[PDB]
Design a protein around this ligand. Structure first.
Ligand SMILES: [K+]
Ligand SMILES: [K+]
Lengths: 587, 587
């Protein structure tokens, strides 16, 4: 009914360049905070020698990297865009790829809801000057204004829908996901891109410890620990693709988890200091989120907390969560991802939410790190929560896997969202042994080779992936780009063979070098070229001619190729962005 | 239902310091644009002598003025706050007063949804530095971040609810009202404060005319004119208080108009140049708003257009509106308020929405100015729209008064909302002649005297206002502030006499000078002091002693005073803010 499916995800966090790397770090209890020597920090000359200066941060690798040609953006415009504009735009491209949806072939309205930090743009460059109304001025406005972080996604991906930017401090991700779900449940959009981005400037930087405040004294974040002194500042990005659950199952999408309910409110007049959870206001938020999804506290067996790492702030949140759960809830796993990566600002709530989605997907509970002395003031045996010290298989006595994530920020911002595990995968009909076309396209030849290398590694990692799903996702879920590569194969092992080396050992490569494609063989459709019969669409020689015509740049109707089978969209490697650095030179 | 009532309003625009001044200007077709001599502009030294520099702007009087004592704000914090923070906060206070709701006594959840321009914050001062997490850092962050434009309202008014800030370029106001109504219709809040703010920095500044662009060549905005060359840049603020219509009628609120539907979308890949309306996307927006409110295009007799004053932009918008209205719609009044005040950016859609709301309230149609030569390319006789050249009474053949307001912006942002006239006023029971308590409170005695002068002036203006509504609104719709004044009167003429002069000729005033009030006479309730019996609440001496106890600083339960009659909330003068100028001295 009112459940919303997460059919694609994309993120970058300290120590992780993608979601697969992020989950692997959480599984092994790794810490992604970076410690620097004095000479490696080239800012804060006035503070670098202070005894209170901590040379630790959660860095975002490649915060200045962008591949503007993939988006049709000039080099001049790429330098004018703030890092949050570029990072979020690249993440939206990835989330469409991860969900196996080609924006050129999406027929519906797509909403883009994002949260951003306006402080970052004000530090990157001077704002636009509106003394005149020329086109170069309008380009500069779209490069700087936070309002256009969401518009640029709609424009540069070729989508049609609505774009809304919100600024909600450290609860930005939840506020974006919250508004996306209202947009879906009211029927205004068909799918929604929701997320947030946080790029702290200056990036390579420490912080100043002050006694009794939220920043850690040694650079480690120790949530629920008696000796915790706070957290570290971090940067990152997290984007998800949302779609109503009944439609997502009908279209055979790939579902990480489902969003049951969301709730937002503000501390208002009952304000606290920064990081302190007000028990009555926050619990009403947590209770409201579970009420929206019709979930009972007995069924929530994982609680992802804000957890700065200060004893007093951890005590208030666990108490607020206890008031919302009641006494009859049972037992629940509690953890905080900030111990791994630090406080990610706008996307801090996203780091916990993405952790919960992967926990539900893999049916595993990752540990909470840097925990050596449990906070005795938090009477944990007298509460429903059990600190997840070790990784463990997720097998709840409840019978269903559900998680709750809380995000706290300054200004009284509260938010809580409740996720449920995805539906059980249906029994699949056996895979037809037939020749298939697989396609890869990028902007230049070197990027296509990187796609071949990425796909060869992926095939080794995911030995349970069906070939008909792989071909279906690559042919119908990726945009056709100028530099193209294709192959006709029948098994996974020959697919691995054509990708290997220079990629030219395949049947399609010999055809394109021998002769140019004869269009008289094909029938013209509105969606491109098609083969004359269904029998030809299972013929190795006919598929080679069709694939070679595509590599040469002709338009091929891939819908009629997979019309007889009901394949599923699966998660495949993302675009291998060329990592050029762009930075403004004039203020 | 699904209809949302506008029960309070507050705005400031070029040439208008309040909504009454704003409506009076629109009625008489006045222009609020300011023209300057060269020496009056103290910026743009490189441009002031260019032949293309136009010394014209839509100034916001008092953009730098604020009264921090009323809100509990320190002078240091008032200087740290951007002008958009102060102006919007001051307008939110006024919109609550206009609706006669005391935030201290509001029992429900109030949402604050506003839109702001981050370019203004970036020009006012340098952003916060988060290298440490002290309390002074948090004060600086709350003064600068656009995210806290809405949060500061919740804190400084004493409200509890949710705050959401959106950044939507030139469609900001509509997106706030759109999101506010989703909050109400989903039952997450009980009433909502929605609006936008735009303070252009530097304020006293011209612009540079370029051929073919949106900025005017002579400083005049001429919407729908054949000789139109564009518009002028302006500043302003507009805030409305929203409440579900059945609840607003049941609570006897004062209703300006009702919101039937709203719709938003983005041009996306079907993008245009700045100010150009794409026919298919904008028409879908307008039609969706009318579909959401269940209004047929035949019933809309007023269309408030974006109307820059450019022939090409006016042609595209009227054509897009034509696609949404259809052929069989009939006739409709068309106008553009930008001819009066210029393009107010974030709140530009608010000026048009406020114009439409007051047009429905007063059943009058204000003219569109600076229109001498009609644009022949728009062919108005072939459209349902007729330019409102003269002021006229609104008497539609349809039978119901409905208006549609459009907001266009950069980045492809589109928005449209449809308003209906308020419900017809119910038949009132005859007014009982009995002694009533009237109250006025401010922070010091001089402000209370200004309140008395404003109220006596107001009584001459509105001779049809009932005395039981005035007392009900003053006693239950205003916050109790330290410096207090009260009187016990029975007619409207007695009220005018006690207000005149020093205000000490009244029964309560002479009581306070002689003796202090004896608190044993009253019964303490959860909401304050109350009279002992029902017969006591109609005794002049009993009411006089209770009012003096209130003037002495006691808290009085005014609900039990008006429990026997069903009075209405009415619009009374706002607080007389003492406006000291605040501006930052260190970048
Ligand atoms: K940097
Ligand atoms: K709520």
């Amino acid at each position: 009914p009112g459940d919303v499916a997460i059919i694609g995800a994309s993120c970058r966090f300290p120590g992780a360049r993608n979601k697969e790397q992020y989950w692997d770090n959480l599984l092994h209890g790794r810490e992604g905070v970076t410690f620097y020597a004095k000479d490696e920090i080239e800012v804060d000359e006035t503070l670098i020698n202070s005894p209170a200066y901590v040379r630790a941060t959660g860095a975002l690798d490649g915060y200045d990297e962008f591949d503007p040609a993939v988006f049709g953006v000039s080099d001049r415009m790429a330098a004018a865009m703030t890092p949050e504009h570029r990072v979020f735009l690249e993440a939206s491209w990835e989330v469409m790829e991860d969900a196996s949806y080609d924006p050129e072939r999406v027929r519906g309205e797509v909403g883009v809801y994002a949260s951003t930090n306006p402080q970052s743009a004000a530090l990157y460059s001077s704002p636009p000057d509106w003394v005149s109304a020329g086109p170069e001025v309008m380009d500069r406005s779209n490069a700087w204004l936070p309002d256009t972080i969401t518009s640029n996604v709609l424009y540069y991906l070729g989508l049609t829908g609505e774009a809304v930017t919100v600024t909600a401090v450290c609860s930005g991700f939840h506020y974006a996901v919250h508004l996306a779900c209202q947009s879906l449940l009211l029927g205004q959009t068909d799918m929604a891109i929701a997320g947030g981005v946080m790029v702290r400037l200056p990036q390579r930087r420490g912080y100043l410890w002050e006694e009794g405040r939220i920043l850690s004294r040694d650079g480690h974040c120790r949530p629920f620990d008696a000796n915790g002194t706070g957290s570290v500042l971090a940067s990152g990005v997290a984007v998800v693709l949302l779609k109503p659950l009944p439609q997502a199952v009908a279209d055979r999408d790939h579902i990480y988890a489902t969003v049951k309910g969301t709730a937002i409110n503000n501390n208002g007049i009952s304000a606290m200091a920064y990081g302190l959870a007000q028990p009555e206001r926050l619990s009403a938020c947590i209770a409201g989120a579970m009420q929206a999804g019709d979930v009972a506290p007995e069924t929530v067996s994982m609680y992802e907390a804000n957890g700065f790492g200060m004893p007093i702030t951890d005590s208030l949140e666990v108490h607020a969560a206890h008031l919302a759960f009641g006494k009859q809830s049972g037992t629940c796993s509690i953890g905080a991802v900030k111990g791994n990566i630090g406080h990610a600002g706008v996307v801090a709530g996203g780091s916990g939410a993405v952790k919960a989605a992967f926990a539900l997907y893999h049916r595993s509970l990752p540990p909470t790190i840097n925990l050596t002395e449990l906070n005795e003031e938090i009477d944990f045996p007298r509460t429903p929560f059990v600190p997840q010290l070790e990784p463990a298989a997720w097998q709840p006595e409840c019978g269903i896997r559900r998680a709750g994530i809380t995000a706290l920020g300054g200004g009284g911002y509260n938010a809580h969202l409740v996720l449920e595990e995805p539906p059980r995968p249906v029994e699949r009909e056996p895979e037809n042994r037939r020749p298939r076309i697989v396609t890869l396209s990028a902007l230049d030849d070197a990027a296509v080779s990187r796609q071949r290398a990425a796909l060869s590694s992926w095939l080794a990692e995911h030995s349970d992936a069906r070939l008909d799903d792989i071909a279906y996702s690559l042919n119908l879920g990726r945009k056709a780009l100028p530099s193209r590569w294709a192959a006709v194969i029948s098994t996974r092992d020959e697919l691995l063979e054509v990708l290997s080396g220079d990629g030219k050992s395949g049947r399609v490569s010999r055809f394109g070098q021998e002769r140019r494609a004869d269009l008289a063989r094909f029938r013209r459709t509105e969606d491109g070229l098609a083969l004359g019969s269904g029998d030809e669409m299972r013929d190795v020689q006919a598929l080679t001619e069709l694939a070679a015509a595509w590599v040469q740049g002709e338009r091929v109707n891939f819908e009629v190729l997979h019309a007889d089978e009901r394949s599923h969209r699966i998660s495949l490697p993302n675009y291998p962005f060329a990592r050029r650095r762009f930075w403004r030179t004039d203020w």
